[model samples]
Target: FNILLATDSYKVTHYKQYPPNTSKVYSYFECREYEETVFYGLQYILNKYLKGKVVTKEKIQEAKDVYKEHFQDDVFNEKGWNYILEKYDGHLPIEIKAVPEGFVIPRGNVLFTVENTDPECYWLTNWIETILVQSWYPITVATNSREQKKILAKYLLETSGNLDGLEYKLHDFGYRGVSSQETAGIGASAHLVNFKGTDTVAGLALIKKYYGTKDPVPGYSVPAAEHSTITAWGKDHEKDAFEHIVTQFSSVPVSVVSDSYDIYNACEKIWGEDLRHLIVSRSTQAPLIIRPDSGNPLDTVLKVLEILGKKFPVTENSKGYKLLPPYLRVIQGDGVDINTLQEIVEGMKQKMWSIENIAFGSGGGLLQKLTRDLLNCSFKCSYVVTNGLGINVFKDPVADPNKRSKKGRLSLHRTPAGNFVTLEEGKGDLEEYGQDLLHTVFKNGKVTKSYSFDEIRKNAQLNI
Candidate 1:
């Protein structure tokens, strides 16, 4: 089966048969459920797939042949495909403009626009709509990460009294847990917009290769151990395995999984008693981070803190909560999603433990558990041009009020009251709502605007 049409065949058949007089279609992408939307992955598509690089006649022919061979029995539009291929000169007949990569768009605002540039290229926008709309994954993941940061920041302020060490509070552990290397890399880069720590090496490479960063990459990780390494030492030698970690990475932060044989025993006996001296002595040199990767997050984390607090010296922050000394900290890497994270933080606060006493590592929940509907994301035709006249187009399903789509050419603007509003295109009087938030990021076959990782990060920080 054709990869491009594997899921979007209906789009080709149904949309190709759209009204006969349709000469152009103007579509806008929006997220209705989420208040602050993070826009991303458009540059990835523009740089990797579009930009006159992969849209050659040879590739177009290959895609058509694959679709013909596998989906011949379906309502395939051979003439429509060929017309697009010939008319565009191996280029996509679309104009795309977006809010900058990490800009925060409001719930009902347009993030980007896709329009058939040539009047005859009516079907091109729908042909490429799948890939364009699929960008919601990375953008949603980034937005979710930023939301997690706000949650963490709130707890941090209440319990720790400051945002110190905020950058390393959340670590990416989603590489092996995601669907593919591309997903892991993209998800990790998105998570980095809010926090800097990560274990996904591919994510680091993505920032360097695509986002244009140099050595000493934005994502960083510490030496750590997994189940295999700990189990390799056998239950009898658990202390020896942990001792090696402290001795090897004595001058830097090191993490050890303490739940191989018995998590409570490992924390209470091995980490707290047997290896307690080594960790204490290395307090000024390198800190020891204990990881518990199983069981209930809130209960397990609070128990781990209780055991560690009994064995290690504890300090009090300005908020009067117990904080782990610089030498010791806990990281709960299991069963940690947004809700569970909040539970753990709240539990710690109830126990009078500072939020700084523990950090978090999220895997599948951080990268893989979201869908476009989570944000009510959609791309719909808002206007069409027929016989040199623009016509407003929209869907208002009588059965579902939320399914109603916006009409006419649309642009996003911010009012003087610091609220976002959608304005109809060519509206001259709405200029007081400020300039259009969407800018031409890609035009014809060229990238008109680009942003560095730092710039993207700054944009998210300022807005989110």
Candidate 2:
């Protein structure tokens, strides 16, 4: 069978500039002379290796032309494009081999590596570190977050007796909470690798453009309880809020922010016996949603459920709300992160609390604050040297095993358990099992294959 991928004809018309006046150059390197070199390198790669496929000399020329056109700006010039080219004698050819983004990998591993293909161009390797490190954080965060979701999945299965309930819970609620618009998408897609859902549709758009199968389904802003907000019982706008919010989007599950004022009191006032029957009468499967933005989310969630149990019994007032048809309901959007989520799951283990009836909207505590370490998540190419004979040699500054780049070319091998091992050998090594770990992603100004967003997403799912 043949698989053909088609995409809209979009050309790169604009390139982002490093922040002005200040010295910061690359994404991580704030003020540096080599920033423009890094910028042009990234621009070159995105245009040449990331755009539409059907490889040909003409396509390659078009990509180079786009980069040249964009590189003449003041920002690019300030980053010392001339100095970079001068050091490399004009052609700075580099081969960058990276694992598809979104695939989960362990720490202390080589995510990817770069080396110059031409001896005189070795200096280009050092100039590109800022750009390289900048692109790496999202991949790092995505890989780590996917690990967290795996933990969540285990929690659901151990406590709930089934996995299906998790489908309605656990969302990527970190877009607003992430540092930038771009990282939001990367982080969300990474979480999706482990069965978590997201409300940040823009983040999902980026994922689809670079790493997803279909455009993401949009999320509805379900209001939850807050100190100043009016309760659902207030004549203010609960009904209007629902009506207007739902009308704005398609296939969007309705969420109601319900915890304003007294959450317990509001439950009694709104989801009382009459209201439960009224909601049921609407012929909606799961029409009403309750949000608890404040108070003890676990406690509030349980209390609200208990109140509904008394009002709507499973055996017509006997088995309790436990038997009520599962419907769209409660989500906790408080500052929930891995730690809070773990605590909530541990609490639920003691007594089931409609695990499927609740969803979690995680924010800052997860996306912005979560990290392996405050100082880590970095890879740097210290220098590239050319001998008197012009033989290129690439060197890394870090000597620790965890920080060391897989030297020479490389190949990623997998064990039956799905974990990967990186293997590297010198040029003369003929053994396939001990072959070089990195493949040539770009060679002689030609890109091998362009991976689609769906392909990347599928790889993430398989490895995550």
| Candidates' C-alpha lDDT | 0.80, 0.47
Regions more than 4 Å wrong, model 1: 1-7, 73-88, 425-430, 462-464
Instruction: Return the top candidate by lDDT.
Output: 1
- Per-residue lDDT of 393 in model 1: 86
Sum up the clashes in candidate 1.
0
Superposition-based RMSD of candidate 2 using all C-alpha atoms, in angstroms: 10.4
TM per candidate: 0.94, 0.67
Query: Which candidate wins on TM-score?
Result: 1
- Angstrom error at residue 202, model 1: 1.4
lDDT of 1 by residue, 1-464 (tens): 22235347567566557687888888888886447887876787677666663344565566677667676764555565556567665566678878888787778778898887776768777777787788888889988888888888888889977888888888899988899998888889889878889998888877887786544798888899999988888778889989987899998988898888788999889988888888888754478989998888888898999988888888887889998888888888888788888898888899999988788999998998888899888988888887778888888999998888888878777777887788875562556667777888777667788888888887888332
